[PDB]
Amino acid sequence: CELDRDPEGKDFQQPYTSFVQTKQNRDGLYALLRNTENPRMHFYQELQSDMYCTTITDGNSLAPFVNWDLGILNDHGRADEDEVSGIAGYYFVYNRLNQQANAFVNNTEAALQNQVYKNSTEIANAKSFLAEGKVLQALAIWRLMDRFSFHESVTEVNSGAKDLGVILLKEYNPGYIGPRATKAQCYDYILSRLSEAIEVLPENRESVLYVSRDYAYALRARIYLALGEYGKAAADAKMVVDKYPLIGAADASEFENIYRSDANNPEIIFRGFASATLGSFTATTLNGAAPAGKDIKYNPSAVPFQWVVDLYENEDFRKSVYIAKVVKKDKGYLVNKFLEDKAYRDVQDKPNLKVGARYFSVAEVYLILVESALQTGDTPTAEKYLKALSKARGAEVSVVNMEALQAERTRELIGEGSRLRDMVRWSIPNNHDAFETQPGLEGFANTTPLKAQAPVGFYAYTWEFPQRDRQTNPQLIKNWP
Amino acid sequence: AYRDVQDKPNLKVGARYFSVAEVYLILVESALQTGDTPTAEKYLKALSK
Amino acid sequence: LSTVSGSVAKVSSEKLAEKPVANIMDALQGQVAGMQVMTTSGDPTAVASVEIHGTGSLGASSAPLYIVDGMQTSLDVVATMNPNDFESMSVLKDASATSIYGARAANGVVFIQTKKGKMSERGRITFNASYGISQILNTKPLDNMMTGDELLDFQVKAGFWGNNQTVQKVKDMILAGAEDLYGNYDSLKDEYGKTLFPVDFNHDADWLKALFKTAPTSQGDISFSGGSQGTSYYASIGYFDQEGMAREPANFKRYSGRLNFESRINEWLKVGANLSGAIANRRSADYFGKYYMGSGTFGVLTMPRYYNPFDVNGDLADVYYMYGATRPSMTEPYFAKMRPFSSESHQANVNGFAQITPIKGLTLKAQAGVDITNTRTSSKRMPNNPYDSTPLGERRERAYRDVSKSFTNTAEYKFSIDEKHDLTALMGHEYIEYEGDVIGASSKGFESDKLMLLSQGKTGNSLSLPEHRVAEYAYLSFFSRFNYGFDKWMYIDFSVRNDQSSRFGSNNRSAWFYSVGGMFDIYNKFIQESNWLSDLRLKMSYGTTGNSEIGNYNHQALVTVNNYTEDAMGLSISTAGNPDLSWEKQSQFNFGLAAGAFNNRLSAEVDFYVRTTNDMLIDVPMPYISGFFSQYQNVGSMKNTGVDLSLKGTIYQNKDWNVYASANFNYNRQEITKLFFGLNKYMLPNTGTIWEIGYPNSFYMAEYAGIDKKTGKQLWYVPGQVDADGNKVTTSQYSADLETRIDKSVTPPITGGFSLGASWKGLSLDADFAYIVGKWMINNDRYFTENGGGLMQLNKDKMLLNAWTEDNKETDVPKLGQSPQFDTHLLENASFLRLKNLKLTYVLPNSLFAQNVIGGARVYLMARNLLTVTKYKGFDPEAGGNVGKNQYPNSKQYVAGIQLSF
Amino acid sequence: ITPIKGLTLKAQAGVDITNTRTSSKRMPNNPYDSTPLGERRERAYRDVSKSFTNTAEYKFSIDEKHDLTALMGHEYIEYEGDVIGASSKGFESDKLMLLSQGKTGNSLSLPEHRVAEYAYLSFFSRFNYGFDKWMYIDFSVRNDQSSRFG
Amino acid sequence: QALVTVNNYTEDAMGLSISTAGNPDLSWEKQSQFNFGLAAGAFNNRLSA
Amino acid sequence: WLKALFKTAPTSQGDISFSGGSQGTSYYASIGYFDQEGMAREPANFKRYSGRLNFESRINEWLKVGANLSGAIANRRSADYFGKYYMGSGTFGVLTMPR
Amino acid sequence: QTAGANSQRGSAG
Amino acid sequence: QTAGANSQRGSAG
Ligand SMILES: CCCCCCCCCCCCO[C@@H]1O[C@H](CO)[C@@H](O[C@H]2O[C@H](CO)[C@@H](O)[C@H](O)[C@H]2O)[C@H](O)[C@H]1O
Ligand SMILES: CCCCCCCCOCCOCCOCCOCCO
Ligand SMILES: CCCCCCCCOCCOCCOCCOCCO
């Protein structure tokens, strides 16, 4: 009598013994990434900035980030067999990306060691898949660092955590429970993974759907800007900034049709595979959008403050695509950056509001370069690229001078979870309580005061490590005092 | 475009009902039967070119 | 059934027959000492959780083994059986009594024997029929909630509607917004202001009525029973329909049949079969326990009363309105019409046994059986619905298959080595096997309700992947049990068994268990026969048992499909794995004492027990850095020490009067003795519970202290911190550091019941009480109802009208504008005493059928859950463990019924 | 039920239930196939045929030389049946062949779905006469209606 | 019944086609049977026909 | 090509019955097995596992009841190229394949 | 899903 | 389906 039962639809972990098996594990990783570096997972940090107020519609889902309810932010979110959302969920999907990338990286390395590939071509591709794995390790460990380690400006913290990074697990080890690496260990790991990948990956991108050298440079220019290493950020930017043309459009709806199209948007350096039937998702947190036959109707839980609306000149194409005057019919603005790729509709008649996961558009490389170029005295390069980007979008900036870089970057990146980071880097406190709500939206978008103030250096700009990690790991030193 | 997997031929096509090359050949045939060898020369040399 | 040294309680047909809920186990809440029955939802499709002598595991399952006539049957399949066919139910409480069962004997064994024929010359045909209603048992949460007017003025002052506003300006806006919305629907734009008044500030909508209704339960029965000369038979066909009282539809419907037969075919062979089957329709209300605007009891309290879901006729409208919505919202009855659901389960339970007795004392019994479930479910999204987001419809079809097999073969040798010494040896082989199956497919883009075959959906981007899940497990067992009989007073029995399971790997799946048992008839060796005492027996047990009730594939380090593109397969790591994963091992000591008095006119029994769990299956939570959620390990250990006692007397007994009563009690102290990785404690994030060595699973939260009467701010005690003689520190700055173990258990320690009964000449009254003492529960509804700093669009408690102000400081309600925290102020005492059953019964007298067809008749009125006693401020103190959360409260029921006998 | 001499009332009722699962695979990596991608199809069939027959029979001897038997009867038979089927393709491995694990997009397909029902309603009679014990006459009339006609 | 059924042209809209011709007066096929028989047996009952 | 496409196939069946009764109560039980393998090499077969319980009883002078219960687990496969003309298939192919 | 915060079922799940 | 001519059935069908 044989008592063995193994689950149908699953196989056993085994070392990589064939090039086809390697490629399949590579793809499964890129499937993971698709739900990790995902716009849904960055809306929390987008809402925690100074741009939004909550509406009478919000069911206390967005209010904790918008109004800084630290008693909720502390242990916010979930990761379980039923939902992976919030701060916990953000923390989980990037660590799983790391754990699973660790397994791909080490298994391809063991397979190259054991010489299990059949010719010189399989060997060189596996060496590339290797480099690709490293970039993802880097991206995982850095997105953790970006929300879970403090920046240099922080005032009071819990004793010792001011220069701690994240728990830095470099191997595939499910049972590992260890302390936080220092910030230096984390950033040097992230940068050495990235730099090793840049030597191996080809100069021209093979595919918008897979990690490229263009992306690695772009991801390292982002990380350098976040670290305040401007000259290095600028240097990486210049490798990639000219390689992807900005969307050319004569009017806003021309911009929209190109912009919202994953496939035709030439600014996209690296996106995740999406079709109507695999890899596309609704991302309606910001806009609160719902199909209504052949039309889209809106009921947002959060809408920009008035100053965010006045950021945009009324001829800026983003004033109709990134934000849209569609609150209460046509009376105020919501953030509409993630409305839809129409290609992912089930029936073309019928909006279903699905987008794909974009990982880097070249507009961010323009702003990285303009800011760094400003910070390093290279005003011609900052002048050129801020005037170039702002002109392409339908409202060329008049002055080029950091103040506009802040204005222009904020205009370009709304909804993408940058402005919180930018507040810390630009030493901006959260002046929420002093902001005018949109006037055409009164009765609907009203004033809600912060449950806690967010001055420059306030510790809660960095999230606390999830309770699950705190409770399970007495070696884990927490962020909040 | 009708393949299930881009790699794998499944040899599917669609129903085509009229293409202008047949219209060219109707025009060339008729132009010859009616003396308009100019029209026949032009369109037949266009299609064949 | 089992042994004389064992802990056993038997409940007879009376307490099982003809209760008006499908959930048979609920009839046993408060009936069996040490058995804690609790149903956390009044959904008719819900099933009771049962714990015998505390919880044995923090990961594996506490559920007893359910066994019907020697076949392991799931409660879902028990639910498809007519309980009027149940002769009795035996609860097996210690290791000596749960020796010839396995898989998860450490949780005890609930044995159900169905009726058998009574060998009589005239067969016994009896008919039953009952009709009744269910309605929500407690409405007290409604009483102190805000009125329409109180809520609107509260909101406006609090600033929710803008800072520059009035009560009248807001009602204009909400009115304007309803009129504007409804005027976009050809189905509303001429009903608004004539038939539909969705916003109304001069009357409060009754949201209890909008979401809950009285619902009927009907059931009926006819039995045949008799036999003759070795052959016996019991046959029964029955009907059962119970409707759910929430307007979200939920029901349990069963058409059922049973044929039990057996026959002494000759001197050496007896055979038999216990055949049963059912067609069953089961429907769940699937929004309860989650927080959805306007949904369930949560919406019953938190819907503003100025929003109205009825039409001018008091029937629910199709749709209702809230300000800001850009699509009106569908009511329950209409949602149900647009989202039809059916499920028809075919249930067959085929079994047989041969009993061969080849020589004196040698009983060889082979038994084999299969329980087959085939379930089809159909689900629709109706097309052309104007209040849906697409006119296109959808449909999903599902086929479920469950096949579960058993073979149990025993040899039993009964011999006596003299006449003052008796021996019975028993050895057995048991094989169990389950294979389960579900497939599902769905289509969409339907444009006509008449054209909705799955094959008629749109192709292309409307296409979808099917559903498919498969599952298998298997249990191989060999077991043995011996009984020794010295004189007539000292009985020792002993057992050893080996169990192997599907669920563990090849080198870890086998485990040995044993039990030792003693019974000592003190009265019949050392008391002869006496005056008051009628009986006294000493009982004692030590033994080990296994629990393996975890998932089916929990040790394998697995990989799974996770595709990136449409043109190539993706693989991703699916599980962590644990190759050593094996059995949870439980030992239990039991010391019992039973007595009978006067002449067994007063019965009693009290038992003491220590139940221990080693190599505990904890689904160990892992740091999210691992990229996993949890992996099962044999890591923990836990202890359950307790007493259960039970007594039964005949109070008064005339020639024409008879009064009786009964009561049972259990106290159970839980104690975590080892967790994992040497950790002393582990707080389960976002549950308010903690595991900590030395204590029971306990609640864990900050201690709310009130408000500072001068700020209006909330206050918490700083735990482990003190001041002058005015001592306990407080802080207005909330932080998780303030959380601490509370001395209240998550599992209730006290579990008892008591029954009163009197019969006076054919008339009879019977009351059945149960209690759960020590139960605590976070009332999660009150995080919303008492929230002054968030969810300000929701209806709140009247107490917030008295919130703190610089002009109103003599209050305990906190100043509006601050969120609550999940502290002790939400931690409610959920202990309760429920009058589970009250049955007035009139047995028509023999004098009327004096007439050769009808033998007798009974009529009865009956109520279920008539009375509740509790301090809990939510709807139902039982509708939860740990947290009370938008509960589908248990039901009260009223039933009238008649019985016929021929 | 025999309530008076000669009178017999027979109620009879039954349901025949068929549930069938079929499973079919196109194995991946077959070198002799047109494609290495595998396929799988799963089907679920259900037949419920219900039937009730209710008859009253009265036998009475009226002469020693005359036996009459009368029988009135009612009968209802109905049938519901369906089948559903789903299928997936593009599997690349023997061990990963759950329907949920197929390729999507152009590899998808509509499910299978058929439904059938019919019913009959019947009222019938049969009479048996017997003079002396050599001449017997039977006589029957009945009425039948069927879902299969309008 | 005289019927129409789904016959979709594109993927964005439903299409209908006539599926059956129909016959409103469909009814039972009616049979009659005249039968004339002769049983017998001979030599005690050792030969039936 | 005959042997290429047709084989000898086994057919096996078992059976056990219980029957009897006393004082106006009858019963008839049965469990059985049956497997008939298809002789074409194209797989075909009918397997069944049968159970039957037949029951009948006179309860009192005026009532007699009964049930004729039956059930089965059955495996049907059919060779689904026969009767059509495919090269190499069936008795057609047995004759028409170049030797 | 207006969950301002629902504790998830601890020991009930 | 290399059939040059199968009569379909009728009476058989
Ligand atoms: C006269 C008395 C009668 C004596 C009869 C005793 C017979 C004893 C035979 C035992 C051997 C049967 O062997 C056992 O068969 C069962 C079903 O039958 C298989 O059962 C299972 O096997 C695998 C595991 O998923 C699957 O292919 C199958 O669907 C599943 O049912 C066991 O894996 C096999 O080991
Ligand atoms: C050789 C051993 C013989 C064992 C054969 C036992 C046959 C058991 O099969 C019964 C199958 O029944 C499944 C029917 O599906 C549900 C029907 O339920 C009817 C409810 O009234
Ligand atoms: C000795 C073994 C006999 C096995 C026979 C199994 C026959 C299959 O039956 C299907 C199971 O359904 C059981 C339902 O029983 C109907 C009871 O109703 C009868 C009342 O008149």
> Which residues from D are below 8 Å from E1, CB to CB?
150
Ligand nearest to the CA of C407: 1
Which of C624, C715, C819 best probes binding to A when mutated, by most A CB atoms within 10 angstroms?
Answer: C624
Query: Of ligand 2's atoms, which has the minimum distance to the CA of residue F31?
Result: 3
Q: Is C313 helix (H, G, I), strand (E, B) or coil?
A: coil
CB contact under 8 A, E1 and D144: no
The minimal CB distance from E11 to the residues C446, C447, C460 is found for: C460
Tokens 């359910």 belong to residue: C66
Among the bound ligands, the one closest to the CA of F27: 3
Q: Which of C117, C144, C172 is the last residue of a domain?
A: C117
For chains A and E, having 3+ Cβ pairs within 8 Å is answered yes
* Adjacent-strand bridge partners of E16: E6
Q: Which residues pair with D78 in a beta bridge?
A: D50, D119
Q: How close does chain E come to A349, measured CA to CA in Å? A: 7
Same domain, C100 and C131: no
The secondary structure element, H or E, covering residue C351 is strand C341-356
Q: Nearest Cβ partner of G9 from C747, C784, C882?
A: C882
Q: How many domains does chain A have?
A: 1
DSSP-derived secondary structure letter, D94: T
Of residues F84, F88, F83, the one with CA closest to residue F99: F88
Q: Which ligand is nearest to the CA of F66?
A: 3
Helix, strand, coil % over all residues of chain B, rounded to 5: 55, 0, 45
Q: Is C678 exposed, middle or buried (0-12, 13-18, 19+ CB in 10 A)?
A: exposed
Joined together, the tokens standing for residue A145 give 């660092």
With contact defined as 3+ CB pairs under 8 Å, the chains touching C are A, B, D, E, F, G
Atom from ligand 1 closest to the CA of residue C433? 31
Q: Which chain E residue lies closest to C393 (C-alpha atoms)?
A: E14
Buried b (16+ CB within 10 A) or exposed e, C542-561: bbbbbbbbbebbbbbbbbbb
Cβ pair C362, C427 in contact under 8 A? no
Residues of C in contact with A72 (CB under 8 A): 819
**Atom 25, ligand 1: residue with shortest CA distance:** A5
Cα separations in angstroms, C412 against C192, C429, C481? 79, 12, 9
Same domain for C81 and C203, yes or no, is no
CA nearest neighbour of A98 among A145, A148, A139: A139
The set of chains that have 3 or more CB pairs under 8 A with B is C, D
Instruction: Please give the backbone phi and psi of residue A160, each rounded to the nearest 5 degrees, phi first.
Output: 105, -20
Distance CA(C518)–CA(D61), nearest Å, equals: 72
For every residue of C366-409, DSSP letters joined together read EEEEEEEEEEEEEEEE-TT-TTSS-S-EEEEEEEEEEEEEEEEE
**3-state secondary structure at position C758:** strand
CA of C428 to the centre of ligand 2 (A): 26
Is C109 found in the same domain as C237? no
Q: How many CA atoms lie within 13 A of A300 on its CB side?
A: 29
Residue with tokens 């962020």: A479
CA of A237 to the centre of ligand 3 (A): 78
- 3-state SS class at B43: helix
Cβ contacts below 8 Å, chain D against chain E, sum to 9
Nearest CA in chain E to C460: E11
Q: How far apart are CA C13 and CA C232, in angstroms?
A: 19
Pair (C23, C135) in one structural domain: no
CA distance F59 to chain D (A): 11
- Report residue C425: phi and psi, to 5°: -110, 145
DSSP, residue by residue, C618-652: EEEE--GGGT-SEEEEEEEEEEEEEEEEEEEEEEE
Same-domain pairing of C111 and C145: no
The answer to whether residues C304 and C204 touch, using CB atoms and an 8 Å cutoff, is: no
C695 and C799 part of one domain: yes
Q: What technique solved it?
A: X-ray
Q: Which of C449, C458, C461 should we substitute to test contact with E (largest number of E Cβ atoms within 10 Å)? A: C458
What residues make up the domain containing A177?
1-481
A412-444 core/surface letters (b: 16 or more CB in 10 A; e: else): bbbbbbbbbbbbbbbebebebeebebbebbbbb
Cα–ligand 1 centroid distance for A1 (angstroms): 6
In chain G, which residue's Cα lies nearest the Cα of C780?
Answer: G6
Total CB pairs under 8 A between chain B and D:
16
- Helices marked H in C159-240: 167-182, 207-211
E to B contact (≥3 Cβ pairs closer than 8 Å) = no
HSE at residue D142, side-chain half, CA atoms within 13 A, is: 18
Residue G4's nearest CA partner among A184, C693, A76, C517 is A76
Give the angle subtended at the CA of C859 by the CAs of C853 and C862, to the nearest 5°: 155
The residue of chain C nearest to residue F30, with distances taken between CA atoms, is: C352
- C95: how many CB neighbours lie within 10 A of its CB? 31
What is the distance between the alpha carbons of residues C167 and C152, in angstroms, rounded to a whole number?
A: 7
Give the whole-angstrom CA distance, residue A324 versus residue A309. 10
Q: Name which of A142, A416, A146 is nearest A267 in CA terms.
A: A416
∠ at Cα A392 (A389, A394), nearest 5°?
Answer: 115
- Cβ contact D96–C455 (<8 Å): no
- Domain containing C288 equals 118-902
When CB atoms are compared, the residue of E5, E11, E14 closest to C447 is E14
Q: Are A237 and A365 in contact (CB under 8 A)?
A: yes
In this complex, which of A8, A11, A275 lies closest to D104 when CB atoms are compared? A275
**Structural contact between residues C193 and C179, judged by C-beta atoms closer than 8 angstroms:** yes
Q: Answer yes or no: are the C-beta atoms of C716 and C702 closer than 8 Å.
A: yes
Three-class secondary structure of residue B24 per DSSP: helix
Judge whether C712 and C815 are in contact, CB under 8 Å.
yes
Report the candidate in C436, C434, C432, C277 with the shortest Cα–Cα distance to residue C368.
Answer: C432
C258 Cα: distance to centroid of ligand 3 (angstroms) = 7
Q: Give the whole-angstrom CA distance, residue A406 versus residue A421.
A: 12
DSSP of C527-588? S-S-SSEEEEEEEEEEEEEEE--S-SS-S--EEEE--SSSSS--EEE-----TT---EEEEE
Residues of F with Cβ-Cβ distance to C231 under 8 angstroms: 20-22, 25, 27
Strand C689-692 and strand C698-701: the pairing is antiparallel
Beta strand C584-597 with C714-717: parallel, antiparallel or unpaired?
unpaired
Compute CA distances B7 → A404, B3, B4, C567, whole Å. 49, 8, 9, 7
Which residues of chain A are within 8 Å of residue D96 when distances are taken between CB atoms? 9-11
Q: How far apart are the first and last CA of chain B?
A: 28
Same domain, C29 and C63: yes
Residue C110 and residue C164 share a domain? no
Q: Tokens for C643? A: 């007493």
Q: What is the DSSP string of F7-28?
A: ----EEEEEEEEEEEETTEEEE
From CA C702, how far away is CA C680, in angstroms rounded? 20
The C-alpha angle A440, A443, A445, rounded to 5 degrees, equals 70
Dist CA A430 CA A453 (whole Å):
7
Give me the residues paired with residue D73 across strands. D55, D124
- Of C293, C357, C370, C280, residue with least CA distance to C324: C293
Q: Specify which residues C253 forms β-bridges with.
A: C241, C281
Distance from Cα C284 to the centre of ligand 3, integer Å: 29
- Indicate the residue type of A125: N
> In Å, what is the CA distance from F72 to each residue of C278, C517, D47?
16, 44, 14
In the 8-state DSSP scheme, what is residue C159? T
Please write down the HEC assignment for all residues of chain A: CCCCCCCCCEEECCCCCCHHHHHHHHHHHHHHHHCCCCHHHHHHHHHCCCCEEEECCCCCCCHHHHCCCHHHHCCCCEECCCCEEHHHHHHHHHHHHHHHHHHHHHHHHHHHHCCCCCCHHHHHHHHHHHHHHHHHHHHHHHHHHHHHCCCCCCCCCCCCHHHECCCCCCCCCCCCCCCCCEHHHHHHHHHHHHHHHHHHCCCCCCCCCCCCHHHHHHHHHHHHHHHCCHHHHHHHHHHHCCCCCCCCCCCHHHHHHHHCCCCCCCCEEEECCCECCEECEECCCCCCEEEECCEEEECCCEEECHHHHHHCCCCCCHHHHCEEEEECCCCEEEECCCCCCHHHCCCCCCCCCEECCEEEEHHHHHHHHHHHHHHCCCHHHHHHHHHHHHHHCCCCCCCCCCHHHHHHHHHHHCCCCCHHHHHHHCCCCCCHHHCCCCHHHCCCECCCCCCCCCCCCCHHHCCCCCHHHHHHCCCCCCCCC
Verify that C447 and C519 share a domain, yes or no.
yes
- Note the resolution in Å, 1 decimal: 2.6
Residues in A whose CB is inside 8 Å of some CB of G read: 59-61, 63, 72, 78, 80
Separation CA A43–CA A445 (nearest Å): 19
Phi first, then psi, for residue C152 (nearest 5°) are: -65, -40
**How many domains does one find in chain C?**
2
Torsion of CA C152, C153, C154, C158, to 10 degrees: 110
Distance F49 CA to ligand 1 centre (A): 15
**Single-letter amino acid, residue E25:** D
Residue C826 DSSP SS3: helix
Closest CA to D48 of D2, D78, D17, D23: D17
Q: Which residues on D lie below 8 Å from B3 (Cβ)?
A: 106
| Domain finish residue from C89, C117, C145 | C117
Question: Rounded to the nearest 5°, which phi and psi values hold at C89?
Answer: -140, 125
Ligand 1 neighbours by CB, cut-off 6 Å: A 1-2, 5; C 433, 472
What residues of E are in contact with residue D150 (Cβ under 8 Å)? 1, 24, 26
The candidate with the shortest Cα–Cα distance to F69, out of C260, C265, C128, is C260
Does residue C46 share a domain with residue C177? Answer: no
C48 and C135 together in one domain: no
* CA B24 centroid distance within chain: 7
Distance, CA C137 to ligand 3 centroid (Å)?
40
**By the 8 A CB rule, do G7 and C878 touch?**
no
C331-C336-C338-C344 Cα dihedral, nearest 10 degrees = 170
- What single DSSP character describes residue E27? -
**Single-letter code of the amino acid located at D26:** R
3 state SS of C209:
helix
Q: Decide which of C61, C93, C117 is a domain's last residue.
A: C117
Q: Do E28 and D144 make contact, defined as CB atoms within 8 angstroms?
A: yes
